[PDB]
Each structure stands twice: as structure tokens, then as C-alpha cells.
Amino acid sequence: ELPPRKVCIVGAGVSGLYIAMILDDLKIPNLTYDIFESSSRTGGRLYTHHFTDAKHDYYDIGAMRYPDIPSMKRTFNLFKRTGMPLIKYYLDGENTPQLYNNHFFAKGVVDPYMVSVANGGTVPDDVVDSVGEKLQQAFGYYKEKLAEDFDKGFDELMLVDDMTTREYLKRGGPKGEAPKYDFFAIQWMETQNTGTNLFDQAFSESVIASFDFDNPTKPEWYCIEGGTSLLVDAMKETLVHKVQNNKRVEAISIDLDAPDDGNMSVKIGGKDYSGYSTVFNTTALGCLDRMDLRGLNLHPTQADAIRCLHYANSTKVALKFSYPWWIKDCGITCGGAASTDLPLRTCVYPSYNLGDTGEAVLLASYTWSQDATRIGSLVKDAPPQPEDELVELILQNLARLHAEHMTYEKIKEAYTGVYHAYCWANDPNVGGAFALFGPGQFSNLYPYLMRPAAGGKFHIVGEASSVHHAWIIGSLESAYTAVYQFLYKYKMWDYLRLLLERWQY
Amino acid sequence: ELPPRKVCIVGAGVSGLYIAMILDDLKIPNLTYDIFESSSRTGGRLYTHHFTDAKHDYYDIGAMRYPDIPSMKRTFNLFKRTGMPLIKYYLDGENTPQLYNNHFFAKGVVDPYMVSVANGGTVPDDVVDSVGEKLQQAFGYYKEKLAEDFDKGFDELMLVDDMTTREYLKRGGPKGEAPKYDFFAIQWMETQNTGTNLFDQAFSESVIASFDFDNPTKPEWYCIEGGTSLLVDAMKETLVHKVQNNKRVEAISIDLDAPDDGNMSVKIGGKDYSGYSTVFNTTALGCLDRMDLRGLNLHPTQADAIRCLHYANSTKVALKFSYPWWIKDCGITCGGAASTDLPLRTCVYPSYNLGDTGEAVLLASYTWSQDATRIGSLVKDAPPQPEDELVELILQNLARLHAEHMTYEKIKEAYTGVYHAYCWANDPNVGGAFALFGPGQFSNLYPYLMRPAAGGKFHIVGEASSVHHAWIIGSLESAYTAVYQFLYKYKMWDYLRLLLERWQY
Ligand SMILES: Cc1cc2nc3c(=O)[nH]c(=O)nc-3n(C[C@H](O)[C@H](O)[C@H](O)COP(=O)(O)OP(=O)(O)OC[C@H]3O[C@@H](n4cnc5c(N)ncnc54)[C@H](O)[C@@H]3O)c2cc1C
Ligand SMILES: Cc1cc2nc3c(=O)[nH]c(=O)nc-3n(C[C@H](O)[C@H](O)[C@H](O)COP(=O)(O)OP(=O)(O)OC[C@H]3O[C@@H](n4cnc5c(N)ncnc54)[C@H](O)[C@@H]3O)c2cc1C
Ligand SMILES: N[C@@H](Cc1ccc(O)cc1)C(=O)O
Ligand SMILES: N[C@@H](Cc1ccc(O)cc1)C(=O)O
């Protein structure tokens, strides 16, 4: 018979909720847990904002779209287990405008944006129209290996992880045997592929990004009708021990001089919570770094990983309109996204309100990196109440982006005066949007992040603690692996076998 | 004989005020200007926060310290022109603690922080105690050329501008003939030299940084007693045309069909302001990118520079204490700064309150880059009203850093309950702290940033538009050069000769 044991789950985002879900399913005798969440809200970076309780009157601030690819099977299994209402998500849609250098994209035209050397810009003529082809040449080998087997493909990709994307493109790969691109070529590739400055982060992250968004299998995409927070609701409801909100862990410790299994503790608001046999930390790493972890005696390079692994910013801005003018006036009738070099960068047309003719939400701006920091600087806790600079910027950018069909006056007139925006680097409980590692970090720092700690009783868990950054799948894989390690540590072979039987696939 | 002319100055930080100062001094017949400032406040990144009107009861949120080196002579000339009360600033002081991996630095100790491979960390033994020497070897040749002649030195440095600092250290310079360092060596150098992740930005910025902070001349440093905002006050006072605050420019244009000198205009709150013969934009580039600039017909690569040139974040946190416990109890009696891998990263002991025995301000945290974003996530426009996570974090970090003489209890007891913090990336009027360029940007994008525009009538001015990022000197040089180009364009030879006579040196 198993002795009584308690574990501690720090954070109630999807990782922490998944750990609890797995433990609840295994039903290990005399095992209990505490889940502590710093926010008044549960769900973390699963976060649907509802303007009203009307059917489609929402947008997803965090996770919103899911590609049905093999590496994400665990995510779709969670969806199935919790009865999520899935509907099609249109990554690409009809008639979505693309605007660069104040020109609209045109199929079959040489340099439609007029940015090549031939037209007075500095993008090389042989690059301006062929970003797709040239990035497929840069990323494709690795994408194919990842599709064959993600783990093996990842291990192969790590052999060039010392390079940034820019460095890879500049030098022609590891041996100089690939094409070499000049600064302006690489700049245009970045502009057409990702957020501002992100080619100066890891080549491996750009490859994995391309694998997820431009997967060789050309997958179907899905979203959750009613918002991703429906998943948080579902996971919360099954909990044998409910989330304790407004509980911010500020320290984690192990008492190595104590003989007991339950010799770990955490500190919350100056008070000790003790008796834990294992602690699963599931917070973003910036939050973890703020804790006093001296009581864990972490390897110094593991500590370095917590402080230094790079996070990217992300900002979303959603506006309500009295009618879906992008559908009715612009012929944008089935989702997709408009891309531009204007400040809003990306305008996402919702896939969940396609048949509505009344009030409708538009995800008017979705940005990463420096673009997100810049939009984020206009996003305030208490929005300007009386002129709102962000609203005016978004309306002006939307007018330019949809100029083939709309005017600023008509868009402003359709705008209801209700909007919401969110900058993830401004969230105290995350401090960024997600991990997006710098050069060398996956191959050098990440293995120390994942190093056993406190004699195998402390786990650093979450999307950053995975090879699938910025996806639910990374959070879930990280959680599963940590539960495996926990069961193994305490030699619970019956329940480890059960874990593999029920939860591996 | 000179026709009436009007110019527009966008922004009233130190660049904008300096343009006006020069124009006011040259007294060109029939020339006037408008200065439009978006904020209700004048001064921009010159910004002293006064807790009360008591003598030393302030800290500088922006610029605060000035090295007396030749390349910054124009800054000290501005100080002299305006009667600034300068006092000594102690960059290095006595008894300032350094805390890494929970160990305190001590001179002569081998691997005091226990991070060497020999002691179970991953920092190579031949690097751990010799970061200074190794970075001087990497930067030194260029620092010396910059000392001989900054312009010539810069031009030589541009020949390796394609590399990040990490890339330079990794590959052994451009030919592999310098020492090559592994990931963990470079990581430790970054940790000991700058903010988290900044070695993944331009090598040239790391060099120029080292040149300014560790100049070969071993300079005296100064600060302005009473706060840097005294300079803003003095510059405002002399203005022939006063700053117009709460005037945010949202568009800039030239009418090329009009034959007049004054064929430029700007838009503010939807209203046109016309008749300008030249427009000087002095805002941070993020603010400029948000404007509608179509009316200027900017070269596409100049537009790219505005969007893409990289900015770094910076955050400051200042606490008031009932007595200067760092002076009285820790023997830190003459300024300097404490450095640590704890979240606060750098604690700066003020140089302006050394003889005070009552209330005193401490610049408890000064951070850059990801460190600043993480502290910044706790800095709110409306500070939490009665528990503040940021305050508690700073108090706990201060206790650890000063554990040789203080306890948390004593520091908390000394804390008055009054503090202020500021994260520059969260300021709508800047959107970052300052330019800190990525690899290749100085050598490729920057020349297009500085390209003549609107037929020589539009100027992009400010610290980013200079080779001295993050210093007043960059702003002043940028302003001076733009005024030169303005006088040249309109062939005002008498006044151009006067500019050279009075303002070159
Ligand atoms: C803008 C954005 C868009 C995204 N898009 C998608 C998408 O389309 N599809 C997809 O699959 N994924 C997407 N992702 C990723 C997905 O949202 C995340 O990977 C996942 O939600 C992360 O879950 P987590 O449990 O690892 O971390 P979190 O969600 O961060 O959960 C950690 C929890 O810990 C809490 N916490 C923090 N500090 C403390 C403390 N001291 N004590 C106690 N608790 C604390 C936090 O409040 C939080 O609730 C997106 C993410 C973002 C930010
Ligand atoms: C944290 C920090 C520490 C620093 N430390 C030092 C130091 O120790 N020593 C040193 O010499 N230098 C230092 N610097 C640098 C120095 O502060 C700056 O380089 C200088 O103040 C920038 O002046 P500027 O005129 O170029 O830009 P800004 O100060 O940004 O002025 C531009 C003005 O334009 C306004 N504006 C923005 N948008 C609009 C619009 N649409 N319409 C109208 N107006 C607009 C802004 O509000 C602002 O007032 C520091 C800077 C920071 C942020
Ligand atoms: N997965 C998130 C964002 C993201 C994806 C991949 C990344 O590498 C980084 C961020 C989305 O759906 O937009
Ligand atoms: N000059 C600012 C900060 C700074 C200095 C140099 C840089 O390259 C960047 C930022 C200071 O005194 O702290």
C-alpha cells in the first residue's frame, strides 16, 4: 500500500491543469495535490476575451488555432477528451489583401511592391519574388526530417543551432555550400516570413516555425467554437482538487536533511506550505526567475537558462464593428489573414463568425517581437476614456489595407467604439508571449533547463520546457514527461505502466 | 532680403530643443518655427522624477551620467551654455557588492562565484576570471581607433558590422584569427558585460558601448545636481517660440506640385498645419513609423530602417529610505553600482546625496533588454494600492545583494513606502529606451535612414539618427547636422558660415 503523498503544481495554465488531469485519471492511492495560481484567473495563455455573452462576440488573446499534424496529436486528443466543439480554421482565405511599400500584391507580376533594385529599392531582383522558394531551400531538408520523426529531426537540427537565421542565410549554411544572401535579401525574407528582427534569433526556431505553419502535409486547421477558454473550463471542472487562485509562489525549497518523501515546500505571501514529495513549476521562466530558489540548489547553468532563455513579445488588438464589412464589402468571406508592413502587421479575419450579418469582431492586429512592443506601448490597463491613439492607428491602417474596397470614414462609421487589446510582455504573470530561443540556446542552455533537480523532485514544466515553443503541444508534452519522471522517481511501476498505457498515445 | 520661412520641429526632447536653440542663436531674418510635442511633458528621455521638492529627493528616469571624453564635448558645451550645476558622478565606488550564483565577489579569488567547469559550472576555467581581459582583446583595436578619430574609427568598425558580438567571439573575428569561444564562455562574458541577450545584437554596438563606459582615457564622470530636467528647463526658457504640448503629429507631407519654399505640412488631430519649408522629425523611430508618411515618398529602404532598426528596453526602479543604509551600514560611501544576476541586475548608489543623513533615494534597479522587460511587466501606470509585487521583489533582492551587512527586515523597516518605477518600452511617446542596432543595421540600413528626403527638406533626427546611440551626444550631433543641411539647402551661406563659426566646436 502506498504511503500518503502530496505534490505541488505551481500555476494553473494548460500544463498545470494537464498534470492534474493525468493524476486524476491515474487515481494513485493516497496521492493528493495543491494547485496554486497567482492570477485571479485560471488558464494562463489560454485566454478568451468575451465582449458580451453573445455567441461569437469574442476573440482569443492567447492560443486560437491548431494544425492537425502528427506532432500535435496529444493536443487533439485533449480536445477529444474534453468534448471541445472544433470548427474549421482558415489559415488562408479568399481575397485577403497584402500591402507592402503601399502597393498591393498581384499574382504573376514581377516585383508588385516595387522594392527591388530594378524598381529603385534594394531587395535583390532574384530574391524579391522568390522568398518562398528560397526559404524552402533553407528550411526544407530539416522540415522533411522533422516530418519523418520530430525528435530525430530535432537532434539533427541541433547540429546547426549555433547559427541565427540571418547567419545561416548570410554564410550559406554550416559549410558555405548553400546560397549566400546579402543583408537586404535577408531583410526582405524576414519581412515576408516573420516578425521584425526575428531572423536574429535561432535558425532552429525559424525552421520549427516553418514546420508548424507551412507543414509538408498541408494540414487542416481548427479552432474552438466559443473560444479556447472553453478548454480551461472543461479541465477545471474535472479537477479532484480545485485551483487555488491569488496564490503567488515566491520561493521553492527542499530540506535535504529530512528523511521523508515530503520534504519540499513553497512560500506564498510569506507563509510556508510544506510536505510536498515533488514540485512541478509550470510558470513562464521570467516568473520562475523571480522566485527565491536557493533552497533547491540548482545547477548554475540551469539557473542561467531560467534567466537567459529568450522570450518574444506578442500583442493582439480586436475591434467590434456593427457589421462584418470585410465579408460584405471586401469579399473576404472565409477567414485568412492580411499581411502588411504597416504597424498593425497582420489582420486576422475570424473563422467563427462567417455567417453573421450583425455585430462582428475583427482581430485587427496581431504582432510579434518589436512590432508587438510598439503596438503594446499603446495598450493601457485603463484605456483612454474621453482620443485613443491605438484605435485611431488601427482604423487608419485598416483603411489603407482595405483601400481597394473601403474608406477610413466607412470603417470608422462601422466601428462600434468597443475594442480590447492585450500585450503579453506586460502581463505580470507571464512577462512575454512565449519562448523563442536565441542562437545556441536550444543546444547549450535547454539541456540544463531540463536537468534533474532537487534529487529528481523538482520539474521545470511548460511550453518553454519543450521543443514545441508557443504551442499547446509543447505544454502538454512537457507535463506528460514530468509526470513520467515523478512516477519513476518513486518507483510506482503499476502506475507508470498505466501512464504509458493510457497517456503515451 | 530673406523671404519669410517657417520650419516644423516634431518633438521637444533634447534634439528638438537643440535645433530651436541653434536657430534662436543664429537669428536668421524672417525665419520662424513651430515645435509640436505629443506629451503634456517637455524633455522626452530627459526626465527627472521628483518625489518631493526637497534638495536631493529625485532620480533620473532617463539620462543621468556624462563621461568627460572628447567625443562628448558638444554635450558638455551645452551644459556650459545653459549653466548646468555639474557635480562628480562616481561610476565606480568603494565597497559595492557583486553577487552571482549567490556568491560575493572578492579580489584575488579564483572563480569566486563557483561557475567554472572545475567547480561544477560550465564556464571554461581560462575565461571565468578573465572576462575583462578577453573583451578588451575583442574590442580594443576598435576602441583605440575610435579614440584616435571617432568617424574614421567607426568607418573601420563598419567592415565587421555584419557580425553580432556572439558571432565575433564564436568565430574568432572576420578571418578566424582571433580567439574562438564556446557558447558558455560567451554567455559568461555577456552576463558580466551587459544586459541579458545583448551579445546577439551588433558587435559594433558592444564596441561603442565599451568605448563609452570603459574609455581608454579613464575619464571623469559628471551628473547634474538637481536632476537632468534642469537642462530641459533651461533650454525651454530661451525659446523664441514656445513648445506646443499635447500636439501629436500623425502625418507629414510635401506638395511637390507647389512651387513655394513652404510646401510641407503636418497633420495633428486630423487638422492640417501647412507652410513649412523644412520638417525636422525628432521622435523615436517607432513613433515615426506610426505616422502616415506617404506624402513624403520615402525611399523603401529608408522606410525599412524606420520600421526595423532595433531598440532596446530599459527600466528603472527607485525607492525612498528613511536613512541611507547603504552609506551608513554597508560602507558604500561614494556612489558606484552593485551588479548581480538577481532580477534587479544593477543597483546604482546616487552620487548626489552622499552627505545626507535623513531621507535618501536609491536607484535600486536599473535594467536593459529582457531583464528590463521582465521588471517592466511589474511596473504599472496606476501602482497597486494597498500588495505590490515589484516592491517586495526589490526589497528581497536588495537584502540578498547587501547580505554582508543588512537583513531584509532592516531594509524593509528603512523603506518609507514611497517608490517610483518606469519602463521606457511602455511609454507611448518613445516605445523603447534607445536604439541598439542588430547585426548589419549600422552598415546597411542606417545610411538609408540618413538619406536626403523630400528633395532635401525632411530630416530624421535624434539619437537613433547618429553613431552615438543612447547618449545626449547622439541627439545633439544629429540635430546639428540637420540644421547644417537645412541652411545648405536654402543656400543661406552667411548663416551656414555662422553655424560653423559658433556651433561646430
Ligand atoms: C499570443 C499567443 C498566441 C498563441 N497562439 C497559439 C495557437 O494558436 N495555438 C496553440 O496551440 N498555442 C498557441 N500559443 C501557446 C499556448 O497559448 C501556450 O503555449 C500555453 O497556453 C502555455 O501554457 P503553460 O501552462 O505552459 O504556461 P501558462 O499558460 O503561462 O501557465 C502558467 C501559469 O502560471 C501562473 N503563474 C505565474 N507565476 C506564478 C507564481 N509565482 N505562482 C503561481 N502561479 C504563477 C500564470 O498566471 C499562469 O496561469 C499562443 C500563445 C500566445 C501567448
Ligand atoms: C533609461 C535611459 C538612460 C539614459 N542614460 C543616459 C545617460 O546617462 N547619459 C546620456 O548622455 N544619455 C542617456 N540616455 C540617452 C538620452 O536620454 C537620449 O539619447 C536623449 O534624451 C534622446 O533625445 P531625442 O530628442 O533624440 O529623443 P526624445 O527624448 O525621445 O525626444 C523626442 C520627443 O518627441 C516626442 N514625440 C513622440 N512622438 C511624437 C509625435 N507623433 N508628435 C510630436 N512629438 C512626438 C516625444 O514625446 C519626445 O518628447 C538615456 C536614455 C534612456 C532612455
Ligand atoms: N503558435 C502561435 C505563435 C507562434 C508560433 C510559432 C513560433 O515559433 C512562435 C510563435 C500562433 O498560432 O500564432
Ligand atoms: N547611455 C545610457 C545607456 C546606454 C549606453 C550605451 C549603449 O550602447 C546603450 C545604452 C547609460 O548611461 O546608462
Task: Classify the phi-psi angles of B199: left when phi > 0, otherwise alpha if psi is within -120 to 50, otherwise beta.
Answer: alpha
Q: Can you tell me which atom of ligand 3 is nearest the CA of A205?
A: 8
Cell numbers of B118, please? Answer: 572545475
Q: Please tell me if residue B299 touches chain A, with a CB cutoff of 8 Å.
A: yes
Q: Which of B300, B428, B444 sits opposite A389 (nearest CB)?
A: B428
B339 bridge partner residues: B98, B346
Rounded CA-CA distance A179/A168 in Å is 9
Q: Is B364 exposed, middle or buried (0-12, 13-18, 19+ CB in 10 A)?
A: buried
Q: Please tell me if residue B164 touches chain A, with a CB cutoff of 8 Å.
A: yes
The sign of the dihedral angle between the CA atoms of A426, A430, A432, A438 is: positive
CB A152 within 8 A of CB A467: no
Report chain A residues whose CB lies below 8 A from the CB of B122: 300-301, 448
Residue B271's contacts (CB-CB under 8 Å, 6 or more residues apart) are none
CA dist A395 → A3, A482, B129, B293 (Å): 62, 46, 55, 16
Method used to obtain the model: X-ray
- Angle between helix axes B493-503 and B472-489 (nearest 10 degrees) is 160
Q: Whose CA is nearest to atom 2 of ligand 3?
A: A470
Residues at the binding site of A for FAD are 15, 37, 45, 64-65, 249, 463, 471-472, 475
- B423 φ/ψ angles, rounded to the nearest 5 degrees: -115, 115
Q: Please tell me if residue A388 touches chain B, with a CB cutoff of 8 Å.
A: no
DSSP state of A456: G
Task: Classify the phi-psi angles of A55: left when phi > 0, otherwise alpha if psi is within -120 to 50, otherwise beta.
Answer: alpha
Angle at B18 between CA B14 and CA B19, to 5 degrees: 125
- A66 φ/ψ angles, rounded to the nearest 5 degrees: -140, 115
DSSP state of B258: -
CB contact under 8 A, A289 and B382: no
Rounded CA-CA distance A390/A378 in Å is 6
Neighbours of B110 (CB within 10 A): 10
**3 state DSSP class of A211:** helix
Closest C-alpha to B69, from B224, B235, B208, B230: B208
Q: Which of B115, B183, B431 sits opposite A300 (nearest CB)?
A: B115
Report chain B residues whose CB lies below 8 A from the CB of A122: 300-301, 448
CB A231 within 8 A of CB A60: no
Report chain A residues whose CB lies below 8 A from the CB of B445: 183, 187
Q: Where are the alpha helices (DSSP H) in A329-453?
A: 369-376, 389-401, 408-414, 446-449
Q: Is B254 annotated as a binding residue?
A: no
CB contact under 8 A, B427 and A377: yes
Q: Please tell me if residue B82 touches chain A, with a CB cutoff of 8 Å.
A: no
Q: Which long-range contacts (CB under 8 A, 24 or more apart) does A294-299 make?
A: A294/A253, A294/B102, A295/A251, A295/A252, A295/A253, A295/A254, A295/A255, A295/A265, A296/A252, A296/A253, A296/A254, A296/A453, A296/A454, A296/A458, A297/A254, A297/A256, A297/A453, A297/A454, A298/A453, A299/A448, A299/A451, A299/A453, A299/B120, A299/B121
Rounded CA-CA distance A401/B423 in Å is 32
CA of B38 to the centre of ligand 1 (A): 36
Cell numbers of A320, please? Answer: 467590434
Rounded CA-CA distance B420/B365 in Å is 11
Closest C-alpha to A121, from A108, A102, A137: A102
CB contact under 8 A, B311 and A200: no
Ligand nearest to the CA of B195: 4
Q: Residue window 101-120, chain B: list those with CB within 8 Å of chain A.
A: 101-102, 113-115, 120
Write out residues with Cβ below 6 Å of ligand 4: B 65, 205, 208-209, 212, 434, 436, 469-471
The sign of the dihedral angle between the CA atoms of B470, B473, B476, B480 is: negative
DSSP state of B384: P
Closest C-alpha to B344, from B416, B411, B430, B414: B411
CB A304 within 8 A of CB A451: no
**Closest alpha carbon within chain B to A268:** B389
CA of B343 to the centre of ligand 3 (A): 27
Domain that residue A163 falls in: 1-504
What string of H, E and C letters represents the secondary structure of B398-416? Answer: HHHHCCCCCCHHHHHHHEE
**3 state DSSP class of B365:** strand
B272 bridge partner residues: B267
Which segments within A183-334 are labelled E, that is strand? 221-224, 249-254, 264-268, 271-276, 278-281, 311-312, 314-321
Closest C-alpha to A35, from A231, A239, A244: A244
User: Cell match 534634439: residue?
Assistant: B15
- Angle between helix axes A493-503 and A14-26 (nearest 10 degrees) is 120
CA of A40 to the centre of ligand 4 (A): 38
Q: In units of Å, what resolution does this entry have?
A: 1.8
- B79 φ/ψ angles, rounded to the nearest 5 degrees: -60, -45
Closest C-alpha to A393, from A481, A313, A473, A317: A317
Q: Please tell me if residue B175 touches chain A, with a CB cutoff of 8 Å.
A: no
Q: Which of B114, B313, B377 sits opposite A428 (nearest CB)?
A: B377
Rounded CA-CA distance B57/B227 in Å is 10
CB B487 within 8 A of CB B502: no
Closest C-alpha to A283, from A11, A482, A465, A43: A11
Q: Residue window 38-67, chain B: list those with CB within 8 Å of chain A.
A: none
User: Cell match 491605438: residue?
Assistant: A390
Q: Is B158 annotated as a binding residue?
A: no
Closest C-alpha to A321, from A205, A223, A197, A411: A411
CB contact under 8 A, B200 and A196: no
Q: Please tell me if residue B290 touches chain A, with a CB cutoff of 8 Å.
A: yes
Closest C-alpha to A441, from A310, A275, A267, A316: A310
User: Cell match 568617424: residue?
Assistant: B151
Residue type for position B178: A
CB A99 within 8 A of CB A338: yes
A222 bridge partner residues: A66, A88
Give the mutation target among B45, B212, B214, B365 for probing the ligand 4 site: most ligand atoms within 8 A of CB: B212
Say how many Å lie between the first and final Cα of chain A, rounded.
28
Q: Can you tell me which atom of ligand 4 is nearest the CA of B433?
A: 10
DSSP state of A174: T
Cell numbers of B198, please? Answer: 545583448
Number of domains chain A contains: 1
Rounded CA-CA distance A387/A424 in Å is 24
Rounded CA-CA distance B369/B432 in Å is 10
User: Cell match 543604509: residue?
Assistant: B325
Closest C-alpha to A332, from A30, A78, A98: A98
Size of interface A-B (CB pairs under 8 A): 159
Cell numbers of A85, please? Answer: 466543439
CB A418 within 8 A of CB A51: yes
DSSP state of A350: P
SS3 content of chain B, % helix, strand, coil (to 5): 40, 20, 40
What string of H, E and C letters represents the secondary structure of B147-182? Answer: HHCHHHHHHHHHHHCCCEHHHHHHHCCCCCCCCCCC
- Angle between helix axes A203-213 and A150-157 (nearest 10 degrees) is 150
Instruction: State the DSSP H helix or E strand holding residue A153, giving kind and residue range, or none if neither.
Output: helix A150-157
CB A26 within 8 A of CB A54: no
